[PDB]
Amino acid sequence: EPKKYAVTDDYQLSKQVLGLGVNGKVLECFHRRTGQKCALKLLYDSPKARQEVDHHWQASGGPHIVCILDVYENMHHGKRCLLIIMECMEGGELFSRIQERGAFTEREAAEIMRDIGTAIQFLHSHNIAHRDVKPENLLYTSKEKDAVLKLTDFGFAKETTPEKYDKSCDMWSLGVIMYILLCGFPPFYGFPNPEWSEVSEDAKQLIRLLLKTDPTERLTITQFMNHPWINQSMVVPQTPLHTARVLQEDKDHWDEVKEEMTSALATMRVDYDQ
Numbered sequence: 001e002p003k004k005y006a007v008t009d010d011y012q013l014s015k016q017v018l019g020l021g022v023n024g025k026v027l028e029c030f031h032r033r034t035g036q037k038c039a040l041k042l043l044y045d046s047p048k049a050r051q052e053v054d055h056h057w058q059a060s061g062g063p064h065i066v067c068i069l070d071v072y073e074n075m076h077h078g079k080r081c082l083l084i085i086m087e088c089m090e091g092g093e094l095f096s097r098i099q100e101r102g103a104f105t106e107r108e109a110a111e112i113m114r115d116i117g118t119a120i121q122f123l124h125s126h127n128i129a130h131r132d133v134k135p136e137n138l139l140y141t142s143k144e145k146d147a148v149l150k151l152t153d154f155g156f157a158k159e160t161t162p163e164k165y166d167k168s169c170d171m172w173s174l175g176v177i178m179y180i181l182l183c184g185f186p187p188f189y190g191f192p193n194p195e196w197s198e199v200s201e202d203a204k205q206l207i208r209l210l211l212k213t214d215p216t217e218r219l220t221i222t223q224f225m226n227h228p229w230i231n232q233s234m235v236v237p238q239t240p241l242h243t244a245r246v247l248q249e250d251k252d253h254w255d256e257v258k259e260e261m262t263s264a265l266a267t268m269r270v271d272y273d274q
């Protein structure tokens with residue numbers, strides 16, 4: 001079902017970029033029939049590019065997953081290309097929105113984790129491990145208060161049809177993202193004062209269960225969603241965290257935390273390590 005006629009018959013392309021994947025640059029575009037601003041990911045054809053589109057297609061109705069609108073197979077400067085047209089996520093990255101504020105609460109963190117959990121729940125019950133869940137891939141649909149948090153970039157995704165191992169990498173990501181959400185800095189562990197002094201014990205113990213060095217002891221997604229901090233997120237205490245202040249104060253090496261997490265996730269994807 002890829003459209004084989006030229007993308008620019010349906011879309012007006014901008015010379016204006018919204019970032020790079022591992023498979024593809026992301027550009028802004030406008031649907032020619034309607035107003036709509038959308039995002040275009042350019043992949044050069046290849047087995048991987050094909051699996052990326054396949055995996056993202058399957059995931060694209062699910063909760064808190066960036067939706068694809070259309071896929072094109074085109075020639076571009078004489079190379080085959082696949083073009084994934086996605087809804088525009090103009091709210092930008094999760095941890096940038098948290099920065100732009102000056103209170104961020106433990107309850108709001110459990111609501112965000114539950115949303116990402118429901119993405120991972122959808123993917124794993126469909127036997128898809130994402131394997132690159134990290135800040136840059138967690139985007140909001142708009143800058144408004146009712147914006148929806150969604151996961152994107154299925155470039156490293158594997159259809160677990162090892163399986164169990166690949167899913168456990170997503171679960172580690174959830175523990176890393178949660179840790180950062182609760183204090184403003186990553187586990188590269190411990191929970192130091194005063195940033196972790198008021199964090200509830202349920203939160204700490206769920207992170208502990210998620211960052212187990214042994215993958216087989218790590219919580220499953222269904223055990224994550226049934227944990228009281230996630231399952232009873234409405235009633236998590238409304239306590240002010242120091243996350244947004246710390247992110248503002250540490251903004252000058254936010255790029256290093258992202259590089260580190262990218263590197264840890266690449267290392268989890270190797271066939272033989274250590």
Ligand SMILES: O=C1NCC2(CCNCC2)c2[nH]c(-c3ccnc(-c4ccc5c(c4)OCO5)n3)cc21
Nearest residue numbers: 018019020021026039086087088089090092136153
């Ligand atoms: O698969 C993707 N990989 C690359 C990135 C994430 C890592 N950082 C560079 C871009 C990415 N971004 C998107 C994407 C999809 C839809 N919308 C947007 C988007 C659109 C408008 C935006 C925006 C993000 O940030 C604020 O304005 N990005 C997909 C991908």
